[PDB]
Amino acid sequence: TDKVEDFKEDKEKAKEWGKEKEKEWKLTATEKGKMNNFLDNKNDIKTNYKEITFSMAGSFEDEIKDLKEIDKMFDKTNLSNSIITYKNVEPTTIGFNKSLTEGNTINSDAMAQFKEQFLDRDIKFDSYLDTHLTAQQVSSKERVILKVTVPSGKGSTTPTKAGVILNNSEYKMLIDNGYMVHVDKVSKVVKKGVECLQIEGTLKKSLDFKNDINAEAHSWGMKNYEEWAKDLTDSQREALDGYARQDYKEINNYLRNQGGSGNEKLDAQIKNISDALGKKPIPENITVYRWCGMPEFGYQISDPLPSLKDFEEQFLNTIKEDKGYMSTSLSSERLAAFGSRKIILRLQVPKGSTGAYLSAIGGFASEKEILLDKDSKYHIDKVTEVIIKGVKRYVVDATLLT
C-alpha cells in the first residue's frame, strides 16, 4: 500500500497541505484567472463544455481560446504527494439513470443495479474532475460519494497531470481529462442519518484529445506509428492503401455480410490488412470516437431516439461486435459528413488492443484515424446525454475487449 495522504474531515490540516501544494503548479495570475473563470462557469463555459467538445469547427470560438490555454496548464503540473480526494455527485452525472434514493434511504434494488453497472469498471467523466481535500457535506441530490485516490506518479515515467488550485476560498484538486476513475469498491454509508453510496476508486490514465483544440492528436499518432507505416511490407502497404481509397466499402460488406466466403481476392487483401494491424499493439490506453447512425444500433431512420430507459434496457451492459473493420477517430470534432447522427460512441481502447494509427500512411486515409482489426467486441458501460444545437444526442461509453 503506497504512501497516501487522507485528511478525512480535518479542513485545517488539509488547508495547510493545500497552501503549499498550490505553489507547486506555478500558474501565472492570468492562468489562474482563466481556470477559475471555468470552474465558476463564467459565460456558461462549464455548462456548455460537453457540447463544445462534440461541436463542429468554428463553434464557440471565444470559449475555445480559453480552453486551449487551460489544456496547456495541465502540462505544467508537478504533484508532489499522493492523496485521497472527495467529491459528491448526483447519480445522473456519472450515468446512473435509475432511481437511487427514497428520501434519506437508498433503494435496496438500486445498490444492486449500481454495483452491477460500476463495480470493477472505469468511469469516464465529461469534464475536468475537480475534487476536495476533505469529505464534503451531503446534499439532497448529490448522493454518490466519490472517494478517489490520486497517485502522484512521482518516480515514474508518467507523472499525474493534476494540481491544486485555490478556488472559492478553498484548495481543490484539479485532474486532467486524460484520467478515468477505476471503481475498486462500492458500499452504502450513512452521513448525518442520510444514506449515500460510496465509490472508492483510483485514477487510471487514458489519453483523450476531445475535439483536439491544440492539434496534438496527429503528433501523438505519428510519434507512435510513423515507424510502423515505414516498415509495412509492399503487400501490406498496397492492401491498406486500397482499403482507405475505396476498398473499405466492399471489404466490410463482405465481412459483415456472410464473410469468409468464396473470394480469394478479398481474403488475400483482408489478410494483409489484419497482419499489418497486428504488428504494433496500441501502446497505451486511449479514448477514440465514432459518430453512429441509427441502423448501427438496430433502429430505423424514421425512429425518434428511444427514451433513456429503453435504450439502456436494449444496450446497457451488453457486448456489441463487428465482423468488419471499425474506423474511429482520436478527435470528437463533429464533421458535416456525419454531424447529424444521434449516437456518439466514446470508446476506451486499452493498451495492447489490435489496431493502428492508419493516418500515418497518408494517401486516402481519414484524419486522425485509428483503425481497429475485424471481429471487434466492446462492452457498453454507460449512456448519457448531450444537447448539440438544441438537439439531444446519446453518448455511449464503452470499453474494447482485448
| Amino acid at residue number 377 | K
Q: How far apart are CA 92 and CA 96, in angstroms?
A: 5
222: which residues sit within 8 A by CB, 6+ positions away? 357, 360
Coil, strand or helix at 265: helix
94: which residues sit within 8 A by CB, 6+ positions away? 118, 123, 125, 144, 382
Q: How far apart are CA 215 and CA 212, in angstroms?
A: 5
Q: Which residues does residue 244 pair with via DSSP β-bridges, in sequence order?
A: none
Task: Write 90-96 long-range contacts (CB < 8 A, 24+).
Answer: 90/141, 90/142, 90/143, 90/144, 91/143, 91/144, 92/384, 94/118, 94/123, 94/125, 94/144, 94/382, 95/123, 95/381, 95/382, 95/383, 95/384, 95/397, 96/144, 96/382
Which among 197, 220, 200, 186 is positioned nearest to 101, based on CA atoms? Answer: 197
Check if the beta carbon of residue 228 is closer than 8 Å to that of residue 279: yes
DSSP element (H, E) containing 251:
helix 248-256
Coil, strand or helix at 392: strand
Resolved by: X-ray
Tell me how many helices (H) and strands (E) the chain has: 10, 18
Q: How far apart are CA 55 and CA 53, in angstroms?
A: 6
Angle formed by the axes of helices 61-73 and 45-53, nearest 10°: 90
CB atoms within 10 A of CB 379: 15
**Domains of the chain by residue range:** 3-205, 206-402
Q: How far apart are CA 326 and CA 374, in angstroms?
A: 7
C-alpha cell at 31: 492562468
Residue by residue, what is the 3-state secondary structure of 281-347? CCCCCEEEEEEECHHHHCCCCCCCCCCHHHHHHHHCCCEEEECCCEEEECCCCECCCCCCCCEEEEE
CB-count exposure of residue 169 (10 Å: 0-12, 13-18, 19+): exposed
237: which residues sit within 8 A by CB, 6+ positions away? 361
Strands in 31-161 per DSSP E: 83-89, 101-102, 105-106, 122-123, 129-132, 144-150
5: which residues sit within 8 A by CB, 6+ positions away? 17, 81, 82, 83, 84
Resolution of the model in angstroms: 1.5
DSSP element (H, E) containing 221:
helix 217-230
- Dihedral of the alpha carbons of 335, 341, 346, 350, in degrees to the nearest 10: -80
Q: How far apart are CA 344 and CA 52, in angstroms?
A: 14
Coil, strand or helix at 56: strand
Largest CA distance in the chain: 73
CB atoms within 10 A of CB 49: 19
**CATH of the structural domain 3-205, one choice from 3.60.20.10, 2.40.50.140, 3.90.176.10, 2.40.128.520:** 3.90.176.10
**CATH of the structural domain 206-402, one choice from 3.40.640.10, 3.20.20.70, 3.90.176.10, 3.20.20.210:** 3.90.176.10
C-alpha cell at 116: 452491477
Residue 3 vs residues 81, 150, 151, 154, 193: alpha-carbon distances, Å: 8, 11, 9, 12, 32
Domains 3-205 and 206-402 share a fold: yes
Q: How far apart are CA 214 and CA 64, in angstroms?
A: 10
